[PDB]
């Protein structure tokens, strides 16, 4: 029954999210988590898209040359010079990348389109020491671009979108710890600089404000902490994310990663960000409920599932804390979590059930089904599966067999037939499902 991870924005483990609206579609560029080796690897660069902010999907990678590298904290995609630029941190270093559209294909914008370790001459910074992470771009009303990065750095960025200015400043803040994940935006003539403090469960965002310029001078309000652990709601370490508003509106949203399952097993959540009359930010009221649909659109209504059952259920995961001894959560893996409408809950088969684990949705009666959409666990590594239908629960007809490990989510099967039961057998990939919708 109990789900401590609520309704995450995306049915995957993602962190460091950059969310924006481009041509009336929402885009979410993020670090893909869940790859099982802490900070030593990541998932590949993928972009999730949504017309409504509720139904999200991705197909393949947007950055072919970077597809096998460790990939962190992409910026927003920035439209300039007829192109889109993005600034991820690849094998620990920042690079400029460019494409004709936000879906890619992106290529390195400086030097050759290849990677080797520790870094190449293609790095964003061209100083002798080119270190730094977590680029954030701002283009001001006068057309001047700026790049912000980790440890409170900022510099002007040239109109070519790849040459950082030689004058680098460090922004003064009243909170002093190691900082990463800068967020910057301008609203009604006030510039806002948001910066992380702490890590793991102690992750917080604080901010400062300027009416002068994106490089300061800045001022700190009394109430300078925007996100922090909320014990009563069970929301821990609300860190590296972004601020966005849909195009043309004054409706601001704060997206944040959460501690999750520890280490790189984070999910991302969104809440409203509100301002006082004096222009100060109201500390965010954090929840795991999301903000619902941000555009009114038509969608097919999903079928009620009467019951679900599975070949096996993984044993509950008791998540060990890192820095907060009171952060004590347990994740269950029951079949009903595949169909509960919450992106923070998942069914997982038992690790020993490694030969065609399966799950059945019973619709209760025979019904006309249009299609199935399956959001598998670790979707960026791909899944091969079989989908079968039955009239009685015993006799099964194969509707479709997918032997390839297609890197996408959701996996959609068009059915248009009457049946009562639907079964998924997983052939390859991680045997779990975040969400399974039948229409």
Residues designated as active site: 16, 180
- Looking only at the bridges linking them, the beta strands covering 432-438 and 347-348 are antiparallel
Q: Which residue in 341, 194, 321 sits closest to 260, CA to CA?
A: 321
Q: Which residues bind a second copy (CB under 8 A)?
A: 23-24, 79, 81-84, 100, 109-113, 121, 126, 139-144, 160, 162-163, 166-167, 188-189, 222-223, 246-251, 277, 295-298
Q: Hey, which residues does 107 pair with through a beta bridge?
A: 98
Q: Which two tokens stand for residue 86?
A: 């993005």
Buried b (16+ CB within 10 A) or exposed e, 172-188: ebebeeebbbbbbbeee
Nearest-approach distance from CB 182 to Ca ion, in angstroms:
7
Q: Is 419 annotated as a binding residue?
A: no
Query: What single DSSP character describes residue 321?
Result: P
Least distance CB 351 / Ca ion (angstroms): 20
190 interacts with, out of a second copy, Ca ion, none, CB within 5 to 8 A per kind:
none
Q: Any binding-site annotation on 185? A: no
**Of 4, 56, 52, the residue nearest 30 (C-alpha):** 56
Of 20, 110, 120, nearest in space to 69 by CA: 120
DSSP 230: B
Q: Is residue 89 near Ca ion by the rule CB under 5 A?
A: no
Q: Which residue is it, tokens 């999750």?
A: 260
Q: Smallest Cα–Cα separation from 428: which of 372, 377, 388?
A: 377
- The least distance separating a second copy from the CB of residue 247, rounded to whole angstroms, comes to 4
Identity of the residue, 20 or 31, whose beta carbon is nearer to a second copy in the bound complex = 20
The contact mask relative to Ca ion for 326-365 (x = CB under 5 A, - = no) is -----------x--x-x--x--------------------
Q: How many residues bind Ca ion (CB under 5 A)?
A: 5
Strand pairing report for 432-438 and 358-376? antiparallel
What residue 250 binds from Ca ion, a second copy, none (CB within 5 to 8 A, per partner kind)?
a second copy
337 binds, among Ca ion, a second copy, none (CB under 5 to 8 A by kind): Ca ion
CA nearest to 337, candidates 434, 439, 438: 434
Contact partner at residue 325 from Ca ion, a second copy, none, CB < 5 to 8 Å by partner kind: none
Taking the least distance from each CB to a second copy, the nearer of 248 and 325 is: 248
Q: How far is the CB of 141 from a second copy (least distance, A)?
A: 6
Separation between Cα atoms, residue 363 and residue 417, nearest integer Å:
13
Q: Which helix (H) or strand (E) holds 304?
A: none
Look at residue 79 and give the partner it binds from Ca ion, a second copy, none, a contact being a CB closer than 5 to 8 Å depending on partner kind: a second copy
Annotated binding site: 240, 337, 340, 342, 345, 434-435
Q: Applying CB under 5 A, which residues contact Ca ion?
A: 73, 337, 340, 342, 345
Annotated binding site for Ca(2+): 240, 337, 340, 342, 345, 434-435
């Amino acid at each position: 029954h109990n789900n401590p991870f609520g309704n995450a924005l995306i049915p995957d483990m993602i962190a460091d999210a950059s969310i924006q609206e481009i041509n009336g579609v929402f885009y979410c560029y993020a670090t893909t988590d869940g790859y099982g080796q802490g900070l030593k690897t990541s998932g590949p660069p993928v972009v999730w898209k949504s017309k409504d902010f509720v139904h999200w999907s991705f197909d393949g990678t947007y950055f072919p040359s970077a597809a096998k590298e460790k990939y962190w904290a992409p910026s927003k995609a920035i439209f300039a010079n007829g192109k889109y630029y993005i600034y991820p941190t690849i094998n620990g270093y920042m690079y400029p990348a460019v494409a004709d559209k936000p879906e890619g294909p992106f290529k390195l914008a400086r030097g050759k389109d290849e990677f080797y370790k520790p870094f190449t001459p293609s790095t964003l910074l061209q100083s002798k020491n080119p270190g730094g992470i977590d680029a954030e771009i701002f283009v001001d009303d006068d057309g001047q671009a700026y790049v912000f990065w980790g440890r409170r750095h900022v510099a002007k960025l040239n109109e070519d979108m790849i040459t950082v200015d030689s004058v680098v400043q460090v922004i003064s803040t009243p909170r002093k710890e190691y900082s990463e994940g800068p967020i910057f935006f301008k609203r009604k003539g006030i510039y806002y600089y948001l910066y992380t403090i702490g890590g793991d469960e102690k992750y917080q965002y604080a901010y400062v404000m300027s009416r002068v310029s994106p490089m300061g001078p800045f001022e700190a309000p009394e109430q300078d902490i925007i996100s922090t652990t909320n014990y009563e709601r069970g929301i821990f370490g609300p860190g590296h994310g972004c601020v966005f508003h849909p195009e043309g509106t004054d409706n601001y949203y704060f997206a944040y990663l959460e501690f999750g399952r520890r280490s790189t097993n984070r999910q991302t959540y969104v809440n409203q960000l509100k301002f006082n009359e004096d222009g100060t930010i109201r500390p965010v009221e954090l929840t795991m409920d999301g903000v619902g649909a941000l555009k009114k659109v038509k969608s097919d209504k999903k079928m009620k599932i009467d019951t679900v059952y599975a070949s096996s259920i993984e044993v509950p995961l008791k998540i060990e804390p890192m820095k907060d001894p009171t952060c004590l959560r347990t994740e269950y893996f029951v079949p009903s979590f595949a169909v509960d409408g919450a992106n923070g809950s998942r069914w997982m088969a038992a690790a020993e059930d490694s030969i065609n684990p399966w799950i059945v949705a019973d619709l209760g009666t025979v019904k006309k089904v249009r299609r199935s959409e399956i959001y598998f666990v670790r979707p960026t590594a791909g899944h091969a599966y079989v989908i079968e239908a039955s009239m009685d629960g015993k006799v099964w007809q194969e509707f479709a067999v997918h032997q390839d490990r297609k890197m996408c989510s959701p996996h959609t099967d068009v059915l248009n037939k009457r049946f009562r039961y639907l079964r998924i057998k997983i052939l390859k990939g991680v045997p779990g499902i975040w969400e399974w919708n039948i229409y």
